[PDB]
């Protein structure tokens, strides 16, 4: 990570526990993502990303494609 920003995404669509693993990897699998904190009960995912590699849009695009609404 060259430049890691800690971003917290509010997530509409995680009603189940399997969603946790799904979305966390959906971000994590993306090269440039450092760590992901998927908070199922809170409806937020706090991700540390290297914005010198992965973009914010990349994160959102993949997450929503997996079936989540994130702001």
Helix percent reads: 25-40%
By CATH reckoning, the class would read Alpha Beta
Shape: globular
Q: List the strand order in the largest sheet.
A: 2-3-1-4
Overall domain count: 1
Distance between the termini: 24 Å
CATH fold call: Alpha-Beta Plaits
Shape-level CATH architecture: 2-Layer Sandwich
Write structural notes for this entry.
The chain has one domain: Alpha-Beta Plaits, CATH 3.30.70.100. By secondary structure, it is of the alpha+beta class. It has 2 helices and 4 strands. The termini are far apart. It is classed as metal binding protein. The entry lists the keywords Structural Genomics, Center for Structural Genomics of Infectious Diseases, csgid, metal binding protein. The assembly is monomeric.
Can you lay out the helices and strands and say which pair or pack?
Blueprint: E1 4-12, H1 17-28, E2 33-39, E3 44-50, H2 56-65, E4 69-70
Antiparallel strand pairs: 1-3, 1-4, 2-3
Question: Short summary of the structure?
Answer:
With 71 residues, the chain is α+β, with helices and mostly antiparallel strands. 31% of the residues lie in helices and 35% in strands.
Could you list some keywords that capture this structure?
71 residues; 2 helices; Alpha-Beta Plaits; metal-binding; alpha+beta; four-stranded antiparallel β-sheet; cytoplasm
């Amino acid at each position: 990570s060259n430049a890691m920003e800690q971003l917290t995404l509010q997530v509409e669509g995680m009603s189940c526990g399997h969603c946790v693993n799904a979305i966390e990897s959906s971000v994590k699998e993306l090269n440039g993502v450092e760590q992901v904190k998927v908070q199922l009960a809170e409806g937020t995912v706090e991700v540390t990303i290297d914005s010198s590699v992965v973009t914010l849009k990349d994160i959102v695009a993949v997450i929503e494609d997996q079936g989540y609404d994130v702001q």
